[PDB]
Every structure is written in C-alpha cells, then in structure tokens.
Structure 1
Amino acid sequence: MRVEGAIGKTPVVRLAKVVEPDMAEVWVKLEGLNPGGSIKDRPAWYMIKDAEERGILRPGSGQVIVEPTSGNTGIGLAMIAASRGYRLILTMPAQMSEERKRVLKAFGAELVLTDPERRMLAAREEALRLKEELGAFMPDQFKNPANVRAHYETTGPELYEALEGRIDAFVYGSGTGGTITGVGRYLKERIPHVKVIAVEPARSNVLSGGKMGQHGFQGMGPGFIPENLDLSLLDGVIQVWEEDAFPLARRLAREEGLFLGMSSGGIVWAALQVARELGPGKRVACISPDGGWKYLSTPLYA
C-alpha cells in the first residue's frame, strides 16, 4: 500500500495523572500519529479521493490542486499530492515561518506568498485567482462535505469502537468543523444521550457570540463559523485560554508522556472541565489533532 493507506486507525489513551478522582474518565485519540502528522490527513485524503470519484481528478495526471493554507491541511494535501502525482500550490501570507515552509516544500508543494498586510484574505484571493487561471481543483476545506464525511466514516467509527460505544461526551476544538460534525453525527446516531461540546479560543470566541481575534491555538478557532460545522449538533461551547491550556499541555507531556500540540492543550483542558461536571463512572472522549513536534519554537515548548 501507499502512504494514504497508512492514514487513520489511531490509538486512544486514558489520562491517569492530570485527572482527579471526582472526574469522569478522559480518553484522548492521538491523531498526531498519522503519516502527515495530524488529523488533517483524513480530510486531505477524503477531499482528493472524493474529487477522483467525481471525475474532477485522476491520479498520476499532474493536475493542479490549489488551497489557501499553510497548516496541517496544507501538509496533508502536500503528502497526498506527492503520493498520487498532483501538482499542489499552497497560498499563504508572506510572514510564514521558515520551519513550516520547509515541511511543505519537503513534500513538493509550491508556495505562493501573499500580501502580509491582507493576511488570510490575500491568500484566499490568490487561490481563487489560480483556480480560475489554471482550472485547478480547490479542496475548499471549510465547505467541502467530503471533509465531514472523512470523520463520519473513519474517525467516528474508530472512536466509538475503541470505547465500546460507551461515551457520555465528545469534546473537540473546531477548526473547519469537519471533525466535530462527522464524529458528532456518528455518535449521536448511536448514543441517544451523548453530548457534543465544541471548544474555541476565548480570544476568538465566535461560537459563543463573541468576536474573532488573534490566538495561539494553531489549527483551531478560525474566527468564523464554517459551512462544515453543524451547529444543531452542539450541546455547548467551552472557551479556553492559552494561559490555562499551555501549562496543561506541558503537564500532559511530563506526567502522561503525551507530547501534544497547542490545540490539544485547549481541547484536553475543556475535556477535564466536562469530566468534572459528569463525575466518576462517566466517560469523556476528545481528540488530539497533532503532536508537539511542529511546535518546539513556540511559547508552548520554548
């Protein structure tokens, strides 16, 4: 098989030190163990495979794929494009870190650096311009239903099976909305009482009725409500602060041997809050989007 075949089937671990006796069990699915280093491997593969199934793409064609991202989705798309023979162009603000650019270029992605002042807007604009000029395929991660489908068909079933259908609450820090929608729907169809709780940065708390803002939870909290997020599934929203999440992420690494990413610290912090509310005997499940490997040069581990 090829690298795309190695995506998924990730393990789930039960926290034992950062939890307290009055809390429900807390289980964390480790998506950083994917070949691309994050949970985004799943929607990256699904969006490309879906495009192949629909006839938009054919592998080994050299066809162009373009997406305005420099994050985990960019890494996942680059990995798949490399394996299946597609030309990938990623647009992103020019103030992008050298480290991240090196990872993307390692996979052969072409990078187009856009106006640092216009931020994400300029990146989106260039991706649209390229899509039109080249007749390229744009995954469109925030609106593509195949993103949600990836989680409804793989992540959800895996989580449900591993925890033997015993889940009282599912907690996740939403980015594109694909994971919480896909997993959330899968669980709610089988567990009548399960609660689906979204997590977002207090500094960019739009789901809570607040306002967008800069924050340090890379990968989550886009500052807007994506089309792939089904709000009707949510039973609540927990706002998290880096001041609380980062120290917790460090505890996870030193006390549980779980070296996770920035968003994982926020997600697990929220999961613990839910665990205290539900109490002993109950089970809270959450997902770690990625490991700490890409963040050694950030406040989390610096």
Structure 2
Amino acid sequence: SRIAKDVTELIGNTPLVYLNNVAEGCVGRVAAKLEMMEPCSSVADRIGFSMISDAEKKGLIKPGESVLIEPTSGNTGVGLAFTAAAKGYKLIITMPASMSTERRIILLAFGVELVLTDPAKGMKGAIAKAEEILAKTPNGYMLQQFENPANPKIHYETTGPEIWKGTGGKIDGFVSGIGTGGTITGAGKYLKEQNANVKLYGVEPVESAILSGGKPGPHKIQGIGAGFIPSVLNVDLIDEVVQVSSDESIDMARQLALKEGLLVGISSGAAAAAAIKLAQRPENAGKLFVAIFPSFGERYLSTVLFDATRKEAEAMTFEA
C-alpha cells in the first residue's frame, strides 16, 4: 500500500456491490459498478483525466501553456475541472446560464473559467461559444468528449478490466446507459475480447430512444440520451437496447437509496431498472449482469430527483 502522487492516481478501481432488496424476483444477479466512488463521485472522472493525460503524452498540450476548453453541462466538466486543477491547466467550460447555480459553484471552486451562454440556445449556444472561444484563443484546446478516442480508450484499459477481474470472468452481461457512448464501447470491447458470449445491453430514455428507432426527446435521466450517435459510440457492439422512462429511473434511483443505502443519481437508477428487468427474464437464471452506477446522488439535491422528499423537508415544521 502506497501514497498516490496526486488526486489523479486515485481515478478508477471502483467497487462492485450486489443489489439485494431491489432485485427481488430476479433469477439472475446484478452487481453495481459504483463510479460514485470515483474521486469526484462520477464516471466522467475517467475521461476527464484520460483526454488530458492523452493530449499531454501526445505533446499537443502543456500546463498553463495550453488552454483547455469544452462544451458540457454535465459531470465531465467536474471530471476535467479537478484534473486541470492538479495539473495546472486554465479551463473554460461553456454551458447555458440555465444549469443550476451549484453546478456553477463546483467548477468555480476548481478555478474553472465557466462561461455562460444563451440559456435558450441549449447546447448549440454552448458549443458555439465553445468553438468560438477556440478559434479565438491562440493555444485553446477543444477536448470533445464525444469525438476524442481517449474517452472509450480509458474504459478499454480500466473500467473494462476492473469489471472483468472483478466478477472473476463470470460476468454474463454488461449494462450501461449511453451518454457519449464511451463507457459501453471502451469497457465493452474489452469484455467481448475476453468472452464473445458477453452481452452489451445499451440503456437509453424511453422518451428519447433514438437507437430504438424513436425520435430524440427531452427527459430527466440526466447524463444519457444525448439524442444522437456520438462518434465514439460504436453501436455495432450493442447486443440489445433496453429503454426506461424518466419515471422508473427516478423511482428506481429512490428504491436504491432506501433498500441498498446507495445514494445515486437518476442515471444510475435507470441502469439498474434495466439490469433488474433483464435479471428477471427466466432464460437468464444464474447469469451475472454488471450495471454501471455513473454518479452519486448528492450532486442532484437540486433536481427533479429530490423535489418529492424536498417538500417533505421545507414543509415539515419543528416539534417541541
């Protein structure tokens, strides 16, 4: 046992816990890959560092000399934020003035030069500014979590293995929600390379199931269902696409807290419902599914996920 040179040696090597009370009635088992345990409690912590580490080894960027830029409103902002933090990188994350003031604090806290755009233009208003700021900045650098290959690479070298070596090769199916598609692909390719019978089940919002023939729509399952095929996503690897609604996802994310003591984000719930539904198909008795729980639930107190219990809060008045 030794001391890590810095916060970045702490990335990866996340734990595997079974689902007990929620998997009621399954003939199969479901192990949860807890990315919430990542240093900044998110799976993005892998692509954040990965993409930087990579552009570094390639010699395309150098601390303070280069100026990382990146369009995103989700966790990769944080995964990048703390990696740029320890490695001394000026960072600029573009996102509409819409995203909570908290997701703004967290990056500010990391010295992230967050730049807000028109909260009506959505992602385009962000990427515009993003791209803009790039063409504008001499030594600016666009990471592009959806295009960059370091993304699935990292998953091919760690998440992939971690899962394999975790289940000791007995893994029967890999369940993952598709955001940039990096995880499912990267880690996915590596398992298939260790066993072709391994099944990669893709998960996406029922309300925005594009890989199911459906049309992109808005949903609450924050973190996946980008409404399109990220270049890094290699759909051919997917053996099946399970769809889940923002509602099951939510509910499931809640049962997870009250029955497993796993406080997780709504994307994790969805990945879990998916995994349990599969575990219940008769023909899968005895099989092992590994579902990725992408984030911790504390970074969602200000979201649809907590509105319910949130009233139970402010409302309830003190007792004497």
Contact 1:250 1:301 in 2 (8 A): no
* Structure 1 runs not aligned, ≥5 long: none
Match of 2:78 in 1: 75
Secondary structure at 2:115 match in 1: strand
d(CA) in 2 for partners of 1:245, 1:148: 25
Secondary structure at 1:187 match in 2: helix
Match of 2:317 in 1: none
Contact 2:100 2:302 in 1 (8 A): no
Q: CA deviation at 1:62?
A: 4.5
Larger Rg: 2
Q: What code does the residue aligned with 2:110 have?
A: F
Matched, 1:9 2:13: yes
Match of 1:254 in 2: 258
Contact 1:21 1:280 in 2 (8 A): no
Match of 2:127 in 1: 124
d(CA) in 1 for partners of 2:49, 2:219: 28
d(CA) in 2 for partners of 1:75, 1:180: 21
d(CA) in 2 for partners of 1:87, 1:245: 36
1:26-175 mapped onto 2 (5 Å cutoff): 26-59=30-63, 61-135=64-138, 136-175=140-179
Match of 1:234 in 2: 238
Alignment counterpart, residue 298 of structure 1, candidates 294, 303, 314: 303
Using the TM superposition, name which of 90-99 and 146-155 deviates more. Answer: 90-99
Contact 1:142 1:227 in 2 (8 A): yes
Match of 2:269 in 1: 265
d(CA) in 2 for partners of 1:270, 1:21: 14
Secondary structure at 1:23 match in 2: coil
Deviation string, structure 1 residues 27-58 (Cα, Å, up to 9, x no partner):
00100111122000001111001100111112
d(CA) in 2 for partners of 1:35, 1:63: 24
Alignment counterpart, residue 225 of structure 1, candidates 229, 234, 245: 229
d(CA) in 1 for partners of 2:20, 2:100: 35
Q: CA deviation at 1:158?
A: 0.3
d(CA) in 2 for partners of 1:113, 1:21: 47
Q: What code does the residue aligned with 2:291 have?
A: C
d(CA) in 1 for partners of 2:183, 2:153: 9
Deviation string, structure 1 residues 153-196 (Cα, Å, up to 9, x no partner):
01010010010011111010010010000111001011121110
Secondary structure at 2:92 match in 1: strand
TM score, norm. by length of structure 2: 0.92
Alignment counterpart, residue 211 of structure 2, candidates 207, 210, 213: 207
Secondary structure at 2:210 match in 1: coil
* Structure 2 runs not aligned, ≥5 long: 308-320
Deviation string, structure 1 residues 87-106 (Cα, Å, up to 9, x no partner):
00011111121111011111
Q: CA deviation at 1:203?
A: 1.1
Alignment counterpart, residue 24 of structure 1, candidates 11, 28, 51: 28
Q: CA deviation at 1:21?
A: 4.2
Match of 2:290 in 1: 285
Change (3 A) 1:29 1:22: closer
Deviation string, structure 1 residues 176-222 (Cα, Å, up to 9, x no partner):
01000011100101112111010000111111111111111111110
Contact 1:23 1:272 in 2 (8 A): no
State the Cα RMSD in Å.
1.1
- Report runs of 4+ in structure 1 exceeding 3 Å deviation: none
TM score, norm. by length of structure 1: 0.97
d(CA) in 2 for partners of 1:22, 1:95: 41
Change (3 A) 1:18 1:115: same
Aligned length: 301
Q: CA deviation at 1:279?
A: 3.0
